[PDB]
């Protein structure tokens, strides 16, 4: 019955300061400590601090002292975490969780993703990937699509409007120098390409763009 409702994703540039929320319901908010955790592929799960909504007292992990501030609103059973002087290092996912003295963190919010970039909305450049000299050794061939230089996420990619769903690999996007770049390959029978046209359809909602890139033999 307990439920932790976290605020949505956030996108800000360095030097900025955001304030995430965690609305609690289904129990007596002032009876349990609210904890906050940071998650990143490089650092993993990191405890940030805890607040006792009852009186407002807080404990902080030395590592985030000065970086994070925890508060609460007793009347609206809401907890808050503000992060200042944001840098690309603060880019991660943040969770709030109910702390039980002896049972650990029995409940966790969905988490709020924080992306810190100095970049502004940017449509991707869709680049066709054709096999060297249009060759192929097996009874099958592999084509690809390079979606680079876009912000922010996400991006939608299909092959031939989804008709080709088998044999495809759309790799996770990678952030580099403020922008994202994703990759996608598709494998079909030799008798399919160049014989029949293979097209990469890429959509980027944040910038309202739709691009259809046909893979031509060169």
């Amino acid at each position: 019955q307990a439920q932790l409702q976290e605020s949505g994703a956030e996108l800000v540039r360095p030097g900025a300061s955001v304030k995430m929320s965690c609305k609690a319901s289904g129990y007596r908010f002032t009876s349990y400590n609210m904890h906050w955790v940071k998650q990143t592929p490089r650092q993993g799960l990191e405890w940030i601090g805890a607040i006792y909504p009852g009186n407002g007292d807080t404990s902080y992990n030395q590592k985030f002292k000065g970086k994070a501030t925890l508060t609460v609103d007793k009347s609206s059973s809401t907890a808050y975490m503000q992060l200042s002087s944001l840098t690309s290092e603060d880019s991660a996912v943040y969770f709030c969780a109910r702390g039980r003295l002896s049972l650990g963190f029995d409940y966790w919010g969905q988490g709020s993703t924080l992306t810190v970039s100095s970049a502004k909305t940017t449509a991707p450049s869709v680049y066709p990937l054709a096999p060297v000299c249009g060759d192929t050794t097996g009874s099958s061939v592999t084509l690809g699509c390079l979606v680079k230089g876009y912000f922010p996420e996400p991006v939608t990619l299909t092959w031939n409007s989804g008709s080709l769903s088998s044999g495809v690999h759309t790799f996770p996007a990678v952030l580099q120098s403020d922008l994202y770049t994703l990759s996608s390959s598709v494998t079909v029978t030799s008798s399919t390409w160049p014989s029949q046209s293979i097209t990469c359809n890429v959509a980027h909602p944040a910038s309202s763009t739709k691009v259809d890139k046909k893979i031509e033999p060169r």
Binding site: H35, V37, G44, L45, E46, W47, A50, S59, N61, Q62, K63, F95, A97, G99, R100, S102, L103, G104, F105, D106, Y107, W108, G109, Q110, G111, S125, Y127, P128, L129, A130, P131, V132, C133, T142, G144, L146, K148, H169, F171, P172, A173, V174, Q176, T181, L182, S183, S185, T187, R218
Partner: protein, 212 residues
């Protein structure tokens, strides 16, 4: 600070097998440790508390054991839903600390990577850029090494890699590697190669081409 150590980042298993994930505390914390399970794009889920108790609604195939500094999470009769990442945590004293987690992946027969390389497109070259891409699909184990070699020399600068999660259909792994240069630099060399080393082969797999 109390350091929590999970020596195995990844563990291979099969449906029906039994797995034991270890976790060590740098100090004695009695039984004040918990275990959490987490799946891609989801939040941590509490499984164990007080070292060996299961939270209400957790499968009995899950069992926690240990006290003091050595703990372990055992999963007998493993199921597909049990395939995820596991974190241990000590909530004995501040600062609260977690282990680095252990990923549980489905075991499968070895598979060599299917490698394919691609030159920069006309479109990108017109914009003054040049990216060379290499795909290494459907291979296993996940461990693999990719190298780029321009005219014989290895190039590590300007390379970005992306790995997919273990395929839910064939339990394999795929990887993508892109080398990005400026148009001028690209047209300054001739030989471009993608080299991969993997368990399935004694010698590396080589895919390359020469400009024009």
């Amino acid at each position: 600070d109390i350091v929590m150590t999970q020596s195995q980042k990844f563990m291979s298993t099969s449906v029906g097998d039994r797995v034991s994930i270890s976790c060590k505390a740098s100090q004695n914390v009695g039984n004040i440790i918990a275990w959490y399970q987490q799946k891609p794009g989801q939040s941590p889920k509490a499984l164990i508390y007080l070292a060996s108790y299961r939270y209400s609604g957790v499968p009995d195939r899950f069992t926690g054991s240990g006290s003091g500094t050595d703990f372990t999470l055992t999963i007998s009769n493993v199921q597909s839903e049990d395939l995820a990442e596991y974190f241990c945590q000590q909530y004995s004293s501040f600062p609260l600390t977690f282990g680095a987690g252990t990923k549980l992946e489905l075991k499968r027969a070895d598979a060599a990577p299917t490698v394919s390389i691609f030159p920069p497109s006309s479109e990108q070259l017109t914009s003054g850029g040049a990216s060379v891409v290499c795909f290494l699909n459907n291979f296993y184990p996940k461990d693999i090494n990719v190298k780029w070699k321009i005219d014989g020399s290895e190039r590590q600068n300007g390379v970005l890699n992306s790995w997919t999660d273990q395929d839910s259909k064939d339990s394999t792994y795929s990887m993508s590697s892109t080398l990005t240069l400026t148009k001028d630099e690209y047209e300054r060399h001739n030989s471009y190669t993608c080299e991969a080393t993997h368990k399935t082969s004694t010698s590396p797999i080589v895919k390359s081409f020469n400009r024009n």
